[PDB]
């Protein structure tokens, strides 16, 4: 059945037919909704239908369904799954599949940009040194002196599960976290475990507050190897406030390039376990989550201190006042340094426009309200009042286990 989604602010109603094309499961049932649950080695047998599905949708996309090339590709992929237990995507298919994995990412508010993705084919990589080279080129290309450009670098696909390529880092650029003897945490608390794994692997921590972690790179299932990103490649922004001259005295900074490196890219039944992809930041991703979460930098109290706010009772909303000011500073700093960044009002406004486009030309847009709504000022953004339908299309980005839980060392 067709399904309608209403925006309760504009009263626009859109009709979803695209959900009818999905086959993966969401985790909900008719009686239980798991919409706020964060996470609810193929064979030739399972592989060909997935490949056939994806080839069919590719040749449908380029308006050549049932063509000579289409019939030939199908048979070409048929004989190759038979005789090799897998197949290899054409370059065109790889690009199409990566763009559509972004397009199908129900949790991403930045998808208005989806077809503007620079795809780096790294399927000929064999060693971690090679991965490091490919990754530096990604970081340099995507950073582009502050005029950030979305990119993805795709390493060789999984074969037997024993030879995976993995980026052990959760992002390419992240700050170290140090669990202090006195209990607390220096640096970034999100990364305490990974930082310890890098130290145990030989990394010599500077033990500052903003130490860029090394790359820890696993090629073809071998042990991971440490690499330092050349510092001239790592663009950073000192956070200052446009009114509070004392803000810069907090000593804060962040990196310009958000580049997620621990997810899995699935295309036509093939699994790409190393596929770092980058875009540019929405300001709340730094100023709200990375700075004010209890298990992150947790700087809310100091800012409210310097603002001389009454912090005795929660109903003074001192946390809310300090949160807005931190986010003002983040946007101001990136914009003053001409580093690409988007505020949650512009981003969500763009996403509503993106939804309109997708419903017109595609029949729907899978979208995860729980993730699309920004972590502050929810209802004064247009996505808050936008009903969304969440469903799982492929190609897709998926979660995968942390490598240090599966990898057999030597």
Ligand X SMILES: C[C@H](O)[C@H](O)[C@H]1CNc2nc(N)[nH]c(=O)c2N1
Ligand Y SMILES: Cc1cc(N)nc2cc(-c3ccc(OCC4CC4)c(CN)c3)ccc12
Residues in touch with ligand Y (CB under 6 A): 38, 258, 260, 277-282, 285
Nearer to ligand Y, 58 or 114 (CB): 114
Catalytic, 280? Answer: yes
Alpha-carbon span 375 to 364, nearest angstrom: 25
Binding mask 33-52 for ligand X (x = CB under 6 A): ---x-x--------------
Total residues binding a second copy (CB under 8 A): 68
For ligand X, the binding residue among 8, 65, 246, 399 (CB under 6 A) is: 8
Nearer to ligand X, 24 or 34 (CB): 34
For ligand X, the binding residue among 123, 248, 385, 392 (CB under 6 A) is: 385
- Confirm or deny that 330 is annotated as ligand binding: no
Q: Which candidate, 208, 134, 131, 133, places its Cα nearest to that of 168? A: 131
According to DSSP, residue 337 is labeled: T
Among residues 225, 285, 325, 358, which one is catalytic?
Answer: 285
Nearer to ligand Y, 197 or 260 (CB): 260
| Residue 278, Cβ density class (10 Å: 0-12 exposed, 13-18 middle, ≥19 buried) | buried
Nearer to ligand Y, 358 or 368 (CB): 368
| Residue 227, Cβ density class (10 Å: 0-12 exposed, 13-18 middle, ≥19 buried) | middle
CA distances from 304 to 118, 172, 186, 200, 299 (A): 41, 32, 20, 37, 9
Total residues binding ligand X (CB under 6 A): 9
Q: Is the omega angle on the peptide bond into residue 395 within 30 degrees of 0, that is, cis?
A: yes
Residue 346 interface partner, choices ligand Y, ligand X, a second copy, none, CB cut-off 5-8 Å depending on type: a second copy
The number of beta carbons lying within 10 Å of the beta carbon of residue 181 is 6
What is the DSSP code string of 35-69? TT-S-----HHHHHHHHHHHHHHHHHHTT-TT-HH
Among residues 166, 280, 358, 365, which one is catalytic?
Answer: 280
Alpha-carbon span 19 to 394, nearest angstrom: 12
Tell the smallest beta-carbon distance from residue 213 to ligand HEM (Å): 18
Tell the smallest beta-carbon distance from residue 302 to ligand Y (Å): 23
The residue range among 165-173, 271-279, 315-323, 395-403 that interacts with a second copy, by the rule CB under 8 A, is 315-323
Alpha-carbon span 139 to 136, nearest angstrom: 5
Catalytic, 369? Answer: no
Residue 90 found at the interface with ligand X (CB under 6 A): no
Residue position matching structure tokens 């996505």 = 383
For Cα atoms 284, 304, 322, give the angle at the middle one, nearest 5 degrees. Answer: 25
Q: After which residues do gaps appear in the chain, with C to N over 2.5 Å? A: 40
List binding-site positions for L-arginine: 171, 280-281, 285
Name the site residues for a second copy (rule: CB under 8 A): 3, 5-6, 8-9, 19, 22-38, 283, 288-289, 292-295, 300, 314-317, 319-321, 323-324, 327-328, 331-332, 335, 343, 345-346, 368-370, 373-380, 384-392
Q: Which residues are catalytic?
A: 108, 111, 280, 285
């Amino acid at each position: 059945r067709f399904l309608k989604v209403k925006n309760w602010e504009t009263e626009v109603v859109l009709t979803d037919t695209l959900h009818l094309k999905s086959t993966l499961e969401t985790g909900c049932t008719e009686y239980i909704c798991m919409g706020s649950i964060m996470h609810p080695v193929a064979t030739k047998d399972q592989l060909f239908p997935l490949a056939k599905e994806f080839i069919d949708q590719y040749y449908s996309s380029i308006k050549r369904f049932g063509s000579k090339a289409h019939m030939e590709r199908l048979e070409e992929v048929n004989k190759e799954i038979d005789t090799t237990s897998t197949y290899q995507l054409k370059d065109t298919e790889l690009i199409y599949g990566a763009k559509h994995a972004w397009r199908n990412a129900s949790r991403c508010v930045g998808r208005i940009q989806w077809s503007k993705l620079q795809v780096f084919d790294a399927r000929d990589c064999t060693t971690a040194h090679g991965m490091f080279n490919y990754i530096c080129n990604h970081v340099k290309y995507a950073t582009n002196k502050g005029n950030l450009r979305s990119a993805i670098t795709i390493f060789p696909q999984r074969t037997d599960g024993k030879h995976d390529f993995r980026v052990w880092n959760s992002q390419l650029i992240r700050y170290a976290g140090y669990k202090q003897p006195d209990g607390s945490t220096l640096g970034d608390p999100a990364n305490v475990q990974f930082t310890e794994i890098c130290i145990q692997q030989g990394w010599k921590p500077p033990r500052g507050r903003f130490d860029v972690l090394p790359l820890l790179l696993q090629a073809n299932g071998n042990d991971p190897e440490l690499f330092q990103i050349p510092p001239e490649l790592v663009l950073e922004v000192p956070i200052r406030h446009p009114k509070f001259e004392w803000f810069k005295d907090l000593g804060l900074k962040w990196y310009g390039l958000p580049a997620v490196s621990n997810m899995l890219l699935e295309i036509g039944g093939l699994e790409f376990s190393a596929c770092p992809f980058s875009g540019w930041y929405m300001g709340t991703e730094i100023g709200v989550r990375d700075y004010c979460d209890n298990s992150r930098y947790n700087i809310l109290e100091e800012v409210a201190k310097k603002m001389n706010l009454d912090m005795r009772k929660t109903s003074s909303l001192w946390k809310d006042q300090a949160l807005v000011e931190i986010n003002i500073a983040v946007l101001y700093s990136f914009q003053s340094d001409k580093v690409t960044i988007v505020d949650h009002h512009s981003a969500t406004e763009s996403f509503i426009k993106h939804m309109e486009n997708e419903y017109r030309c595609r029949g729907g847009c899978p979208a995860d309200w729980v993730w699309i709504v920004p972590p502050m000022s929810g209802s004064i953004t247009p996505v808050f009042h936008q009903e969304m339908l969440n469903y799982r299309l492929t190609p897709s980005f998926e979660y995968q286990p942390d490598p240090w839980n599966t990898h057999v060392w030597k």
